[PDB]
Amino acid sequence: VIRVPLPEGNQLFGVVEQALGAGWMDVRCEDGKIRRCRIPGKLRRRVWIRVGDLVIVQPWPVQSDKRGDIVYRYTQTQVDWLLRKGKITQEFLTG
RNA sequence: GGUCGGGUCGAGCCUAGGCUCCGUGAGGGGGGAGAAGUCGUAACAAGGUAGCCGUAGGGGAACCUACGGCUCGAUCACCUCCU
Ligand SMILES: [Mg+2]
Ligand SMILES: [Mg+2]
């Protein structure tokens, strides 16, 4: 079929609003509470993330409010591919 | 031994008068770390206006300009002074 970063384990879907700075990313998920993603060191080299890139992250059971952590990105050949299956509704990106 | 009178040493207790210690503090100010946030290019080569020191004025910010000094300034010419 296809190998896509679905929610495996406890993953989250990160669609960011603004970069306050130094790696903090305010994310706007379907969950509601303002989460603030940060980044590991394996990908800070070869990839390039910005706004509008729906990507996958991972949250942390501490306070479940401001969490998230990048593990892998999405390429433009998947971001809109993930619409027809309805796995994610894009109206969590226009309001 | 008790009671009244007079002096003498007296800790505490109360008043107001100055000092400092002590945690909680509205609001303000700089310091140090994070370097996939934004604006520029000040320094190092003659860093593209040579850099730096004292004093005063100015500017989003590194910074700019006027007077007096230093070489820890590079290139061409002509002198000058010696080995
Ligand atoms: Mg310059
Ligand atoms: Mg200069």
Side-chain angles (χ1 to χ4, degrees):
Chain A
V1 190
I2 205 153
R3 183 48 52 182
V4 51
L6 296 190
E8 322 196 11
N10 62 3
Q11 302 190 259
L12 250 53
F13 271 107
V15 278
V16 313
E17 305 208 275
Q18 200 261 357
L20 287 174
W24 288 65
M25 296 304 214
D26 305 357
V27 283
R28 193 74 200 102
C29 320
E30 76 194 25
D31 318 296
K33 279 77 67 177
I34 169 171
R35 288 177 162 67
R36 314 170 148 284
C37 280
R38 296 272 313 192
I39 176 69
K42 179 178 260 295
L43 321 174
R44 207 163 167 128
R45 55 182 184 92
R46 79 194 295 207
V47 306
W48 179 49
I49 295 92
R50 206 191 44 97
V51 77
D53 311 288
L54 180 138
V55 288
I56 55 143
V57 306
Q58 298 202 339
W60 312 321
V62 281
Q63 198 147 52
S64 161
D65 289 356
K66 308 97 192 172
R67 299 291 151 243
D69 201 286
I70 298 172
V71 168
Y72 195 12
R73 80 170 164 193
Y74 264 114
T75 55
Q76 204 166 256
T77 318
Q78 272 93 29
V79 51
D80 304 329
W81 188 96
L82 267 69
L83 177 136
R84 214 154 292 140
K85 316 208 83 74
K87 304 299 293 296
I88 43 184
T89 186
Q90 281 71 2
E91 306 326 305
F92 280 121
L93 284 70
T94 39

